[PDB]
């Protein structure tokens, strides 16, 4: 009866927030899905670096690239004040953890640009994630639906999306995410494992967080995507909306 009424409870949390809000909550093991505007494609900001990382790792899994390939980064590509070498793995690491824009654009460069990332998402079963711009170009947003992003995270958590070492590598990066620790984690009980990737537009124009919540005991995992676009609320109140949405989803699925 909790997973039952989660939708009504979530819709009351975001009431009067304005803007466009997409929510998707999927219990990984059973597939139980709760969504509000779950198929509306909304601006991703740095959340797009998660599809990017999967696109890069699929290049490696399809014998067109390797994890330890050295890549040269220069100040002309703008940590990056000297011409430095970084492995492909190190580029994914900094792109996921610090949302680093120089490394992300080099990774986009490696896989063939935004259209190639979009094609890979389609090939993997996520036709509602549209990558159209680099970070320099956006400096027409990259958009994605909450359900597509949540379903991607389900497959990542299940071991279906990537090889096991790449899945552990990417989730490890997402565990160490340093930019949105008061979003999905903000209202969860102490000791709840969370892997996530955030996205933030300047002055509260976009507040996003997507990730995987580990439930206690053997009650499973939650894939959760919250995309907030153009809300009237303060940045802090938008982050609190994500934290409370995440806690409501947790409570509904836990005993």
Phi-psi region of 81 (alpha: psi -120 to 50; beta: other; left: phi over 0): alpha
Q: Is 76 exposed, middle or buried (0-12, 13-18, 19+ CB in 10 A)?
A: exposed
16, 24, 116, 126, 202 from 122: Cα distances, Å: 34, 19, 10, 5, 29
| Residues 52/108, Cβ–Cβ less than 8 Å | yes
Q: What is the DSSP string of 104-144?
A: HHHHHHHHTSHHHHHHHHHHHT-TTEE----HHHH----EE
List active site positions: 46
What residues are paired with 84 via a beta bridge?
73
User: Closest Cα partner for 142 from 90, 101, 93, 170?
Assistant: 101
CATH topology of domain 2-253: Beta-lactamase (3.40.710)
| Residues 75/81, Cβ–Cβ less than 8 Å | yes
Q: CB neighbours of 53 closer than 8 A, spacing ≥ 6?
A: 92, 95, 96, 107, 170, 173
Resolution in A: 2.2
Residue 205 DSSP label: S
Q: Quick one: the chain helix, strand, coil %, rounded to 5?
A: 45, 20, 35
Please report, for the chain, the start and end positions of each structural domain, with discontinuous segments joined by +: 2-253
Technique used to solve these coordinates: X-ray
Characterize the bridge pairing of strands 221-229 and 20-27: antiparallel
- Residue 115's CB is within 10 A of a number of other CB atoms, namely 12
User: Closest Cα partner for 222 from 252, 197, 202?
Assistant: 252
């Amino acid at each position: 009866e909790a997973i039952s009424m989660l939708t009504e409870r979530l819709s009351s949390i975001i009431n009067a927030a304005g803007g466009d809000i997409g929510i998707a909550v999927i219990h990984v093991e059973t597939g139980h899905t709760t969504a509000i505007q779950g198929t509306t494609q909304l601006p991703l900001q740095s959340v797009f670096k998660l599809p990017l990382a999967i696109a890069v790792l699929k290049e490696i899994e399809e014998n067109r690239l390797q994890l330890d390939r050295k890549v040269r980064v220069t100040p002309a590509d703008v940590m990056w004040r000297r011409p430095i070498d970084r492995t492909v793995a190190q580029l994914i690491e900094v792109s996921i953890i610090r949302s680093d824009n120089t490394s992300s654009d080099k990774l986009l460069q490696l896989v063939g640009g935004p259209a190639a990332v979009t094609h890979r998402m389609r090939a993997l079963g996520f036709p509602n994630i549209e990558i159209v711009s680099t970070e320099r170009e956006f400096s027409r947003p990259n958009t994605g639906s909450a359900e597509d992003l949540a379903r991607l995270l389900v497959q990542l958590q299940k071991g279906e999306l990537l090889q096991p070492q790449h899945s552990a590598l990417l989730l490890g990066f997402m565990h160490r995410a340093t930019t949105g620790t008061e979003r999905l984690r903000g209202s969860l009980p102490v000791g709840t494992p969370v892997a996530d990737k955030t996205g933030t537009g300047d002055a509260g124009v976009v507040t996003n967080d997507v990730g995987i919540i580990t439930l206690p005991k053997g009650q499973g995992h939650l894939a959760i995507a919250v995309l907030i676009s153009g809300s009237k609320l303060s940045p802090a109140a938008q982050e609190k909306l994500i934290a409370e949405i995440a806690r409501a989803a947790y409570d509904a699925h836990v005993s």
